Design a protein around this ligand. Sequence first.
Ligand SMILES: *SCC1=CC(C)(C)N(O)C1(C)C
Ligand SMILES: *SCC1=CC(C)(C)N(O)C1(C)C
Ligand SMILES: *SCC1=CC(C)(C)N(O)C1(C)C
Length: 127
Amino acid sequence: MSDFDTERVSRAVAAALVGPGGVALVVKVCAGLPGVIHTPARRGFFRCNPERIQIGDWRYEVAHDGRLLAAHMVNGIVIAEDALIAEAVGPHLARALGQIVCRYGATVIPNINAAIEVLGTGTDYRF
Ligand SMILES: *SCC1=CC(C)(C)N(O)C1(C)C
Ligand SMILES: *SCC1=CC(C)(C)N(O)C1(C)C
Ligand SMILES: *SCC1=CC(C)(C)N(O)C1(C)C
């Protein structure tokens, strides 16, 4: 075959890979602390997202959307524009169970938070 794997490998990998578990260990272990971490040259994006598919990286919108820096307020659209279509992917909670820990837990968030705060500012809003 040109791509085949057993359930444990297939599902666990799919669920994990798609869900937060796979991405959790892969990105965590690969990246090493998601809160902190910034790369220069890149497709502008791809990785470090709340269970969102790596999409939305436009050609001409980079500045418009990537206005997060100055007009940091405007980016509010980036979420107010197409989100109403993703804001239905909530059931992912059950899958995104891990979303539960950081929700009903959260540790490697408050800490990096005090730095993030410094490393960026916090001058932002999130829901
Ligand atoms: S950290 C591993 C990783 C991240 C990303 C930039 C999405 N990649 O292409 C690899 C798989 C190398
Ligand atoms: S990891 C950098 C990054 C990309 C994008 C998905 C746009 N983000 O929300 C952050 C700022 C985490
Ligand atoms: S589980 C990730 C998370 C943390 C917090 C900031 C409390 N949240 O609202 C979500 C659930 C997105």
